[PDB]
Amino acid sequence: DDRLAFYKQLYRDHARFDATLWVVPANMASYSDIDKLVEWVGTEQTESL
């Protein structure tokens, strides 16, 4: 949360209109992460209730 709070501080300062920020846990050393991350980055933009 100390890293999480920082990006919130950084966003609430430098954010303009139309601006959307996304923070995620990520490990570039893991091939699984890379595949799973972009599989997340590339799918839908949809929220099913």
Partner 1 sequence: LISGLSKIGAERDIASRLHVVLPGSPNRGMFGGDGAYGEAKSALDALENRWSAEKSWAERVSLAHALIGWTKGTGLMGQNDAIVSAVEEAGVTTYTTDEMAAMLLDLCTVETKVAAAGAPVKVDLTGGLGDIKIDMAELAAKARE
Partner 2 sequence: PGQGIQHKGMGMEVRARSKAARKVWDSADKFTRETLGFSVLHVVRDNPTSLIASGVHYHHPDGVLFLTQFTQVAMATVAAAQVAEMREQGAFVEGAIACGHSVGEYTALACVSGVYELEALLEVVFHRGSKMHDIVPRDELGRSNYRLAAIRPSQIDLDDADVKDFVAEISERTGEFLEIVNFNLRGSQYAIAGTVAGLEALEEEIERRRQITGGKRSFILVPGIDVPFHSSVLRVGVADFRRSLERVMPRDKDPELIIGRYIPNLVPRPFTLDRDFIQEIRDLVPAEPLDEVLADYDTWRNEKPKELCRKVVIELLAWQFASPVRWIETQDLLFIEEAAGGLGVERFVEIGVKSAPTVAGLATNTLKLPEYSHSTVEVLNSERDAAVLFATD
Binding stretches for partner 1 (CB under 8 A): 28, 34-35, 38, 41-42
CB of 41 to partner 1, least distance (A): 7
Binders of partner 2 among residues 29 to 48 (CB under 8 A) are 44-46
Task: Give whichever of 21 and 34 is closer to partner 1, judged by the CB atom.
Answer: 34
Angle at 13 between CA 3 and CA 22, to 5 degrees: 50
Could you tell me how far CA 43 lies from the centroid of its own chain?
A: 14
Please choose, from the candidates 33, 35, 14, the residue with its C-alpha nearest in 3D space to the C-alpha of residue 24: 33
Residues of this chain that bind partner 2 (CB under 8 A): 44-46
